[PDB]
Design an enzyme around this catalytic site. Structure first.
Site, PDB file in Angstrom:
ATOM      1  N   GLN A  58       0.825  -1.204   0.000  1.00 28.36           N
ATOM      2  CA  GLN A  58       0.000   0.000   0.000  1.00 28.36           C
ATOM      3  C   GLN A  58       0.859   1.252   0.000  1.00 28.36           C
ATOM      4  O   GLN A  58       0.609   2.187  -0.766  1.00 28.36           O
ATOM      5  CB  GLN A  58      -0.932   0.008   1.208  1.00 28.36           C
ATOM      6  CG  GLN A  58      -1.660   1.322   1.398  1.00 28.36           C
ATOM      7  CD  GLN A  58      -2.938   1.167   2.181  1.00 28.36           C
ATOM      8  OE1 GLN A  58      -2.994   0.425   3.156  1.00 28.36           O
ATOM      9  NE2 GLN A  58      -3.980   1.865   1.753  1.00 28.36           N
ATOM     10  N   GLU A  71      -3.247  -7.151  -2.182  1.00 23.21           N
ATOM     11  CA  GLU A  71      -4.564  -6.616  -1.875  1.00 23.21           C
ATOM     12  C   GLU A  71      -5.131  -5.903  -3.090  1.00 23.21           C
ATOM     13  O   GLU A  71      -4.428  -5.112  -3.729  1.00 23.21           O
ATOM     14  CB  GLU A  71      -4.493  -5.638  -0.703  1.00 23.21           C
ATOM     15  CG  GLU A  71      -5.727  -5.633   0.177  1.00 23.21           C
ATOM     16  CD  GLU A  71      -5.560  -4.761   1.408  1.00 23.21           C
ATOM     17  OE1 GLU A  71      -4.412  -4.378   1.717  1.00 23.21           O
ATOM     18  OE2 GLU A  71      -6.577  -4.465   2.069  1.00 23.21           O
ATOM     19  N   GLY A 128       3.629  -7.001   5.611  1.00 17.28           N
ATOM     20  CA  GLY A 128       3.884  -8.247   4.904  1.00 17.28           C
ATOM     21  C   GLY A 128       4.103  -8.046   3.416  1.00 17.28           C
ATOM     22  O   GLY A 128       5.055  -8.575   2.841  1.00 17.28           O
ATOM     23  N   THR A 129       3.221  -7.278   2.773  1.00 18.24           N
ATOM     24  CA  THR A 129       3.391  -6.986   1.354  1.00 18.24           C
ATOM     25  C   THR A 129       4.686  -6.227   1.109  1.00 18.24           C
ATOM     26  O   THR A 129       5.503  -6.616   0.269  1.00 18.24           O
ATOM     27  CB  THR A 129       2.197  -6.190   0.831  1.00 18.24           C
ATOM     28  OG1 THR A 129       1.884  -5.136   1.752  1.00 18.24           O
ATOM     29  CG2 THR A 129       0.987  -7.089   0.653  1.00 18.24           C
ATOM     30  N   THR A 185       1.821   2.337  13.693  1.00 20.66           N
ATOM     31  CA  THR A 185       0.479   1.875  13.386  1.00 20.66           C
ATOM     32  C   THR A 185       0.341   0.361  13.364  1.00 20.66           C
ATOM     33  O   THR A 185      -0.787  -0.135  13.354  1.00 20.66           O
ATOM     34  CB  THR A 185       0.019   2.436  12.034  1.00 20.66           C
ATOM     35  OG1 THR A 185      -1.362   2.112  11.828  1.00 20.66           O
ATOM     36  CG2 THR A 185       0.847   1.852  10.908  1.00 20.66           C
ATOM     37  N   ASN A 228       3.731  11.388   0.991  1.00 21.99           N
ATOM     38  CA  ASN A 228       4.108  10.843  -0.305  1.00 21.99           C
ATOM     39  C   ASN A 228       4.502  11.944  -1.275  1.00 21.99           C
ATOM     40  O   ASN A 228       5.340  11.725  -2.149  1.00 21.99           O
ATOM     41  CB  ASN A 228       2.967  10.002  -0.874  1.00 21.99           C
ATOM     42  CG  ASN A 228       2.505   8.930   0.085  1.00 21.99           C
ATOM     43  OD1 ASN A 228       3.148   8.675   1.098  1.00 21.99           O
ATOM     44  ND2 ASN A 228       1.379   8.303  -0.225  1.00 21.99           N
ATOM     45  N   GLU A 278      26.750   5.940 -10.393  1.00 21.80           N
ATOM     46  CA  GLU A 278      27.764   6.598  -9.585  1.00 21.80           C
ATOM     47  C   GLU A 278      27.248   7.044  -8.223  1.00 21.80           C
ATOM     48  O   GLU A 278      28.061   7.460  -7.389  1.00 21.80           O
ATOM     49  CB  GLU A 278      28.365   7.779 -10.344  1.00 21.80           C
ATOM     50  CG  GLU A 278      27.499   9.002 -10.455  1.00 21.80           C
ATOM     51  CD  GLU A 278      28.211  10.105 -11.200  1.00 21.80           C
ATOM     52  OE1 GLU A 278      29.336   9.858 -11.678  1.00 21.80           O
ATOM     53  OE2 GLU A 278      27.671  11.222 -11.292  1.00 21.80           O
TER      54      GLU A 278
HETATM   55  N1  LIG Z   1       4.834   7.338   4.364  1.00 24.70           N
HETATM   56  C1  LIG Z   1       3.784   6.575   4.083  1.00 24.70           C
HETATM   57  N2  LIG Z   1       3.652   5.340   4.680  1.00 24.70           N
HETATM   58  C2  LIG Z   1       2.584   4.560   4.403  1.00 24.70           C
HETATM   59  C3  LIG Z   1       1.618   4.988   3.513  1.00 24.70           C
HETATM   60  N3  LIG Z   1       0.682   4.025   3.420  1.00 24.70           N
HETATM   61  C4  LIG Z   1       1.031   2.999   4.224  1.00 24.70           C
HETATM   62  N4  LIG Z   1       2.203   3.322   4.846  1.00 24.70           N
HETATM   63  C5  LIG Z   1       2.939   2.470   5.786  1.00 24.70           C
HETATM   64  O1  LIG Z   1       2.925   1.151   5.278  1.00 24.70           O
HETATM   65  C6  LIG Z   1       2.791   0.209   6.317  1.00 24.70           C
HETATM   66  C7  LIG Z   1       1.976  -0.998   5.852  1.00 24.70           C
HETATM   67  O2  LIG Z   1       2.010  -1.100   4.446  1.00 24.70           O
HETATM   68  P1  LIG Z   1       1.585  -2.462   3.699  1.00 24.70           P
HETATM   69  O3  LIG Z   1       2.395  -3.624   4.202  1.00 24.70           O
HETATM   70  O4  LIG Z   1       1.778  -2.293   2.218  1.00 24.70           O
HETATM   71  O5  LIG Z   1       0.019  -2.683   3.988  1.00 24.70           O
HETATM   72  P2  LIG Z   1      -0.866  -3.609   3.009  1.00 24.70           P
HETATM   73  O6  LIG Z   1      -1.013  -3.032   1.627  1.00 24.70           O
HETATM   74  O7  LIG Z   1      -2.211  -3.872   3.632  1.00 24.70           O
HETATM   75  O8  LIG Z   1      -0.032  -4.974   2.947  1.00 24.70           O
HETATM   76  P3  LIG Z   1       0.199  -5.830   4.278  1.00 24.70           P
HETATM   77  O9  LIG Z   1      -0.071  -4.960   5.477  1.00 24.70           O
HETATM   78  O10 LIG Z   1       1.630  -6.291   4.278  1.00 24.70           O
HETATM   79  O11 LIG Z   1      -0.717  -7.025   4.299  1.00 24.70           O
HETATM   80  C8  LIG Z   1       2.136   0.950   7.469  1.00 24.70           C
HETATM   81  O12 LIG Z   1       2.832   0.686   8.662  1.00 24.70           O
HETATM   82  C9  LIG Z   1       2.247   2.425   7.131  1.00 24.70           C
HETATM   83  O13 LIG Z   1       3.017   3.095   8.096  1.00 24.70           O
HETATM   84  C10 LIG Z   1       1.745   6.225   2.908  1.00 24.70           C
HETATM   85  O14 LIG Z   1       0.891   6.617   2.122  1.00 24.70           O
HETATM   86  N5  LIG Z   1       2.831   7.019   3.196  1.00 24.70           N
END
Ligand SMILES: Nc1nc2c(ncn2[C@@H]2O[C@H](COP(=O)(O)OP(=O)(O)OP(=O)(O)O)[C@@H](O)[C@H]2O)c(=O)[nH]1
Ligand SMILES: Nc1nc2c(ncn2[C@@H]2O[C@H](COP(=O)(O)OP(=O)(O)O)[C@@H](O)[C@H]2O)c(=O)[nH]1
Lengths: 52, 430, 431, 24, 36
Positions: free
Chosen positions: B11, B63, B136-137, B171, B220, B246
């Site tokens: 995500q 997802e 995880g992802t 989180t 972002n 480089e």
């Molecule tokens: N800086 C930033 N961090 C983000 C953002 N969105 C998610 N995160 C971070 O990404 C972490 C989880 O991402 P993911 O693992 O991809 O969540 P997911 O897509 O549901 O996949 P899984 O949780 O692994 O099953 C969280 O702890 C957030 O802190 C974003 O838009 N900006």
């Protein structure tokens, strides 16, 4: 050989201290894969320091 | 000729990719439909028969919701439909789930599309993997894809812009777990790993942007500006041209020490804009300020090893030279004894473009400072006890064991991070 | 495209599920006749999670209603939203379990369980990908608890990797509704510990306190309590059905909540619960939602969190909000109430954010707390069960349905084991 | 219909208790 | 007979004599049977 005999005598003494300590002879189809038993945290830290 | 393949996993990866690709489209004039009304887009975009420009990116996720947001959003006609790859079940913040059981078929399809994309490139500078260390992802699937890319592609320079857990605010609960696992995974697979912390970016937004309510879109946007400033020399000419290959040769003193702090300057809203000089020296000092760093880590604790500066806009080699000389003479900023120069300055004639609806102001000068410093071992020290505190009780360990992991894997990851701590101490030492 | 199979068991489960399906149809813009009338696209994007496409524009809940008596689902079918359900999904007997768990699990539910699993398999196989099953029922009742535990066991056998979510109305502490509530609760907790992956604990008296104190109703009927429970039940899975800024599925919540497999019981709450008097006086903001969230009165579980310590806590927010605001608020909560939060977990909050709040609220939040407070509830069930079991009161009915005495002792032993687990983690010290 | 376990420790007790004497 | 008596002494001689979740999951069956 004398040193080895002394070591064997010490092992016999330890066996006398602890009667019939279990030793797993072998494993037959342990359905979930089981790793080695986890060391106590202090021993784990010592092993980590040895690796470092 | 200078193509770079972008991968966005998880995500967070996909959401920072939204900002990154919006920024590139705005920079090159590419409309969201796909086409624009020389050949500066080739680094990120390949033009098709209709004249439509398609980005050389791959949106990977287990997802479907995050990818379907792109499939429905304004950038539905730009990206390739098969480039957007969606899974069926989320990784549920489980590194084992994202690396061992669910991620297999998805990463196989990912390598298939990555091969298709790479066969469309004459040259290939390397890979830009954007994921989230702490899920995880992000962790598991990203680590697996990095492993596969290292196996097959070989010499392509893989730059991982990883988002690591914040020190105190967080989180997720298993975030230290999967963060340590992913750190062990990418310690040997990425070439240059860039650290990012949401808490630090939140502080930057709170102070510099005066945003009392920062959000993921804001974070972002800053990340996208940092990455675009990083790649600006690939797409635009300027004095002291800087290259992807480089980055390593000027930045990675030793292969293990390739984790890098990033800091952008200036970070100023429109109302505070045109109110200060914003000269090269001032913006360089701001970039070396601890507050401007996008990672919650005091640079004063450690010693800088190398600092690569990417200037954008009206910057002259005298100004960069004088600013860096003042920084070197400054007593607070401390460099290692073994790297007397420790500086890689590179200027670009293209000022940073401003995304409409954003908070960043139109500044004629910008600096992206990416530093390899031994201070970063301090955040690793944070994660190393956040890990072991739970690992003593083996909390949430059954969740990871269920999908084909072992206690030995956690132990090996934590031991590798301890070895990295030892490495940081040694390289900081004389 | 991650489908959820809903199941309702017993009178309490059927009523709660009917209210839940009314709430979900309202959220998805579905009229009682099944036609979509939401005029809203994100409502239909993920409608397949709960509903199936009929021949017309009609949508049918993927819900299976079970009972041993016909009256409860006669009322359910004649209710305002009774016509959405497929009549083939009403699986019921002729003679009800007389608040007898043995009757609902061994004698009468066993014949009906074949049809129940047939309908379950029919509904599940049509699903593209199956997230899992959610079963709403009440501990302390014969048909509900008995058939619910039996069905959960069967579905656990059939689909080991699929998620199992349970919403159990635990018998209230101070007033008991049925006499054999401690037997039924003790027997059902034994099954839920072993089989159910995620379980939500609810109390009628706690609901009465919350709706008389925060909501301040005068005569809250069971419909109002079911509306609260349905709000929580919808909010727990809204991240599946709607896009989220930081989305979290049921498995993500389970991973981030459950530290150890058997400690999967949670106390839940919904915010913002406002009295009609102070709706204007309150400020609908993230700090206010967090403050009301972490109040002991907002907990829908009888056990108050103050006595225990929070092992983990997930908070699923809904609405256009600042993730910085949310994260800072929960970090401040943990720092302020560090005494109430377990030390050996560095971060005790799993924060999720969904971009679509429920109809009527600009912001909302459902809270799911894994705390050691539920220890005292299991302890009270122990104190009642042992009191009756010493004199074998009302035990001969369960004996006469073909149940050993030792099944009771095993159930209570496991429940006492869970009690001591909660205590041991409450007083467990780092290093 | 009971199934019951016979402890072998009783047999060990019987073995440890022997008259011997002139008989053995 | 002395050797057999030694074995008989050993029998009851041996009969007479991690994470906490595992610690109680290993003894749950014993607790259930004993409590019955
Ligand atoms: N800086 C930033 N961090 C983000 C953002 N969105 C998610 N995160 C971070 O990404 C972490 C989880 O991402 P993911 O693992 O991809 O969540 P997911 O897509 O549901 O996949 P899984 O949780 O692994 O099953 C969280 O702890 C957030 O802190 C974003 O838009 N900006
Ligand atoms: N929240 C709520 N609880 C109910 C309702 N009806 C019954 N209950 C509770 O459910 C508990 C058990 O009843 P139940 O299991 O349905 O009886 P059974 O159907 O014969 O098994 C009782 O203690 C009631 O307090 C309802 O409509 N709403």
């Amino acid at each position: 050989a004398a040193a080895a005999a002394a070591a064997a005598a010490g092992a016999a003494a330890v066996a006398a201290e602890l009667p019939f300590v279990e030793q797993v002879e072998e494993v037959i189809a342990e359905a979930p894969v089981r790793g080695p038993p986890a060391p106590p945290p202090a021993v784990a830290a010592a092993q980590r320091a040895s690796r470092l | 000729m200078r193509e770079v393949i972008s991968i966005h996993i998880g995500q967070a990866g996909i959401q920072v990719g939204n900002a990154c690709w919006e920024l590139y489209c705005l920079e090159h004039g590419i409309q969201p439909d796909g086409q624009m009304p020389d050949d500066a887009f080739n680094t990120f975009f390949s033009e098709t028969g209709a004249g439509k420009h398609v980005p050389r990116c791959i949106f990977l996720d287990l997802e479907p919701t995050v990818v379907d947001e792109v499939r429905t959003g304004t950038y539905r006609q730009l990206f390739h439909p098969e480039q957007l790859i969606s899974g069926k079940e989320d990784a549920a913040n489980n590194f084992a789930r994202g690396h061992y059981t669910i991620g297999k078929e998805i990463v196989d399809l990912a390598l298939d599309r990555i091969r298709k994309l790479a066969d469309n490139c004459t040259g290939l500078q390397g890979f830009l993997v954007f994921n989230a260390v702490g899920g995880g992802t992000g962790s598991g699937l990203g680590s697996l894809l990095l492993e596969r890319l290292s196996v097959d592609y070989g010499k392509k320079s893989k730059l991982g812009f990883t988002v690591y857990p914040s020190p105190q605010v967080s989180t997720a609960v298993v975030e230290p777990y999967n963060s340590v696992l992913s750190t062990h995974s990418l310690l040997e697979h990425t070439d240059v790993a860039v650290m990012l912390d949401n808490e630090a970016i939140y502080d930057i937004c709170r102070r510099s942007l005066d945003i009392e309510r920062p959000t993921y879109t804001n974070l972002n946007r800053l990340i996208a500006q940092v990455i675009s400033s990083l790649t600006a020399s690939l797409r635009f000419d300027g004095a002291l041209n800087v290259d992807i290959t480089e980055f390593q040769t000027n930045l990675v003193p030793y292969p293990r020490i390739h984790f890098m702090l990033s800091s952008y300057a200036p970070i100023i809203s429109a109302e505070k804009a045109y109110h200060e000089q914003l000269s090269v020296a001032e913006i360089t000092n701001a970039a070396f300020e601890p507050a401007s760093m996008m990672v919650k880590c005091d640079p004063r604790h450690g010693k800088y090893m190398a600092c690569c500066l990417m200037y954008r806009g009206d910057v002259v080699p005298k100004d960069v030279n004088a600013s860096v000389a003042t920084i070197k003479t400054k007593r607070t900023i401390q460099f290692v004894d073994w790297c007397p120069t420790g500086f890689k300055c590179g200027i670009n004639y293209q000022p940073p473009t401003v995304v409409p609806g954003g908070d960043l102001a139109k500044v004629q000068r910008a600096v992206c400072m990416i530093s390899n410093s031994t201070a970063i071992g301090e955040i690793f020290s944070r994660l190393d006890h956040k890990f072991d505190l739970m690992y003593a009780k083996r909390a949430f360990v059954h969740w990871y064991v269920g999908e084909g992991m072992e206690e030995g894997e956690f132990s090996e990851a934590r031991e590798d991070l301890a070895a990295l701590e030892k490495d940081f101490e040694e390289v900081g030492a004389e | 495209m991650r489908e959820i199979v809903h199941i309702q068991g017993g009178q309490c489960g059927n009523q709660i599920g009917a209210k839940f399906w009314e709430v979900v149809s309202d959220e998805h813009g579905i009229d009682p006749t099944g036609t979509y009338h939401g005029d809203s696209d994100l409502q239909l994007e993920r409608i397949n999670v709960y509903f199936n496409e009929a021949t017309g524009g009609r949508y049918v809940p993927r819900a299976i209603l079970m009972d041993l008596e016909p009256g409860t689902m006669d009322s359910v079918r004649s209710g305002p939203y009774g016509q959405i359900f497929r009549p083939d999904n009403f699986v019921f007997g002729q003679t009800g379990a007389g608040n007898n768990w043995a009757k609902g699990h061994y004698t009468e539910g066993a014949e009906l369980i074949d049809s129940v699993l047939d309908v379950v398999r029919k509904e599940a196989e049509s699903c593209d990908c199956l997230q899992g099953f959610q079963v709403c029922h009440s501990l302390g009742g014969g048909t509900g608890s008995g058939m619910g535990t039996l069905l959960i066991s069967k579905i656990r056998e059939e689909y080991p990797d699929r998620m199992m979510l349970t919403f159990s109305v635990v018998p209230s502490p101070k007033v008991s509704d049925t006499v054999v509530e401690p037997y039924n609760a003790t027997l059902s907790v034994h099954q839920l510990v072993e089989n159910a992956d995620e379980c939500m604990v609810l109390d009628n008296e706690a609901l009465y306190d919350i709706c008389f104190r925060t909501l301040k109703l005068t005569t809250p009927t069971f419909g109002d309590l079911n509306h609260l429970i349905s709000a929580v039940m919808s909010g727990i899975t809204c991240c599946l059905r709607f896009p989220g800024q930081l989305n979290a599925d049921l498995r993500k919540l389970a991973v981030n909540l459950i530290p150890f497999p058997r400690l999967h019981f949670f106390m839940v709450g919904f915010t913002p619960l406002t009295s009609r008097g102070s709706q204007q006086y309150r400020a609908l903001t993230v700090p206010e939602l967090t403050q009301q969230m972490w109040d002991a009165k907002n907990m829908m579980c009888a056990a108050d969190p103050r006595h225990g310590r929070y092992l983990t806590a997930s908070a699923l927010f809904r609405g256009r909000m600042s993730t910085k605001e949310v994260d800072e608020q929960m970090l401040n909560v943990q720092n302020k109430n560090s005494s109430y939060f377990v030390e050996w977990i560095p971060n005790n909050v799993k924060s999720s954010v969904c971009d679509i709040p429920p109809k009527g609220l600009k912001m909302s939040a459902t809270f799911i707390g894994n705390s050691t407070a539920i220890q005292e509830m299991f302890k009270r069930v122990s104190e009642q069960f042992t009191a009756m079991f010493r004199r074998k009161a009302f035990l001969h009915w369960y004996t006469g349905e073909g149940m050993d005495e030792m099944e009771f002792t095993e159930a209570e032993s496991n429940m006492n084991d869970l009690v001591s687990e909660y205590q041991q983690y409450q007083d467990a010290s780092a290093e | 219909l009971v199934v019951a376990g016979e402890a072998l420790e009783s047999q060990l007790e019987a073995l440890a208790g022997a008259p011997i004497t002139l008989a053995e | 007979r002395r050797q057999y008596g030694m074995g008989g002494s050993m029998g009851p001689g041996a009969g007479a004599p991690r994470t906490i979740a595992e610690t109680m999951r290993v003894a749950a069956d014993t607790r259930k049977l004993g409590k019955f």
